């Protein structure tokens, strides 16, 4: 019966900042014993399991290094990153154990950093591919920032509009950039009737698109 | 080692019930709750109940009843969550964790997480291809292979490169869903001196089709 709410929903600051986060509970975690509040705090990487970092609203568990701080007290707390570092990408859960459990909506972390342009790379379909009447042209977009990239497909210089898919990665945790990847997707018939295939990448480092391109007989 | 072992992706089909497992080790079985938590994919974690193998009590989170039910066979140190004539909103990650028995009120360590996807359909396999550069290069400094995973179903699929021995340089994106069927993607870069001088392979798994799949990157 009890419920939680964190905020903000979203953050972002750059390498070295200082952070902070907030958990409120409809009622009081806190029994007696002291301190005790029966308050955690979880860390939740893509792609990974939840870890615990710090329990009793303030007791940091172990192997948890020291610029992750646990405060507060009754239906008011607080978690703190000071020099948050580009691994610490994650969503951060608070959990009630007051009485069964109700996890927080929890509070994504973004970092922010330095523009940089994307590396593209084009890639004409592969010959088993083309053997089960599919084709599929894929363009890498890597190692960017910010997030905002828009890509153009092009058949013979006509922009393409339809078959095409598009997906972001999670921020990367080692220098805090992003890639894309967009892929056209053809029947091998339709592959067949044009020569030069073309993605154009415009994102805000360059007001010139990159562009990469090959073609068919190539 | 304290360790939680939970049964692989599985497809259920619609009104069946799913039984999953949660293999406990390296800990006094009888001596910490195991608590079950749901994830959908991109989206929260939320309780779904508890159970305390000593005693065999089971507490619920309101939104589950009727629908999860906890059980702990001690004799397998084995605790396993039954969700009831499932749906779609059923599909979703589903972890254990020991609920420290302690006094610090705090899942410590964590299975690795069973997805399931409710759905009828058939479960497919999906085709791995290689992706080489076209015969024309820049920035030769580095080079970019890449592995396509198209037309499998359900999710996840799993992805390494030289058997995880290729660690650096690798983006795999996730998957988006084409008439029924997922497709995703990743990349590797290298040194342009490396390749194909030394061996690069994509190594693909889809555990709902028990699928693996080593694509060597060739190029051409």
């Known amino acids: 019966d009890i419920v939680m709410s964190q905020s903000p929903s979203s953050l972002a600051v750059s390498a070295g900042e200082k952070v902070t986060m907030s958990c409120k509970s409809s009622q009081s975690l806190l029994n007696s014993r002291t301190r005790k509040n029966y308050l955690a705090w979880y860390q939740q990487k893509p792609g990974q399991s939840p870890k615990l970092l710090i329990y009793?609203?303030?007791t940091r568990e172990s192997g948890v290094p020291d610029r992750f701080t646990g405060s507060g007290s009754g239906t008011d707390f607080t978690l703190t990153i000071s020099s948050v570092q580009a691994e610490d990408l994650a969503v951060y859960y608070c959990?009630?154990?007051?009485?069964?459990?109700?996890f927080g909506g929890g509070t994504k972390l973004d970092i922010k950093r330095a523009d940089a342009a994307p590396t593209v790379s084009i890639f004409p379909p592969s010959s088993e591919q083309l053997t089960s009447g599919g084709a599929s042209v894929v363009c890498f977009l890597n190692n960017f920032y910010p997030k905002d990239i828009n890509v153009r497909w092009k058949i013979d210089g006509s922009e393409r509009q339809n078959g095409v898919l598009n997906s972001w990665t999670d921020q990367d945790s080692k220098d805090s950039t992003y890639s894309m990847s967009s892929t056209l997707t053809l029947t091998k018939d339709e592959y067949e009737r044009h020569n030069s295939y073309t993605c154009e990448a415009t994102h805000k480092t360059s007001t010139s698109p990159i562009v990469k391109s090959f073609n068919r007989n190539e | 080692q304290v360790q939680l072992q939970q049964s692989g992706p599985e497809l259920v089909k619609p009104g069946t019930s799913v039984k999953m497992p949660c293999k406990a080790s390296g800990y006094i079985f009888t001596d910490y709750v195991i608590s079950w938590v749901k994830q959908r994919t991109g989206q929260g974690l939320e309780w779904i109940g508890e159970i305390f193998p000593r005693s065999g009590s089971t507490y619920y989170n309101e939104k589950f009843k009727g629908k999860a039910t906890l059980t702990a066979d001690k004799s397998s140190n084995t605790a396993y969550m039954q969700l009831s004539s499932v749906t779609s909103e059923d599909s979703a990650v589903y972890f254990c964790?020991?609920?420290?028995?302690?006094?610090?009120?705090?899942?410590?360590?964590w299975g690795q997480g069973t997805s399931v996807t409710v759905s009828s359909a058939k479960t497919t396999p999906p085709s791995v291809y290689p992706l080489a550069p076209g015969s024309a290069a820049q920035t030769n400094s580095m080079v970019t292979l890449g592995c396509l995973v198209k037309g499998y179903f359900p999710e996840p699929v799993t992805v390494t490169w030289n058997s995880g021995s290729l660690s650096s340089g690798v983006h795999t994106f996730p998957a988006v869903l084409q008439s029924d069927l997922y497709t995703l993607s990743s990349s590797v870069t290298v040194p342009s001196s490396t390749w194909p001088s030394e061996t690069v392979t994509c190594n693909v798994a889809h555990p709902a089709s028990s699928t693996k799949v080593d694509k060597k990157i060739v190029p051409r």
């Open positions: 959990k009630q154990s007051f009485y069964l459990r109700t």
């Open positions: 009793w609203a303030s």
């Open positions: 964790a020991r609920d420290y028995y302690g006094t610090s009120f705090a899942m410590d360590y």
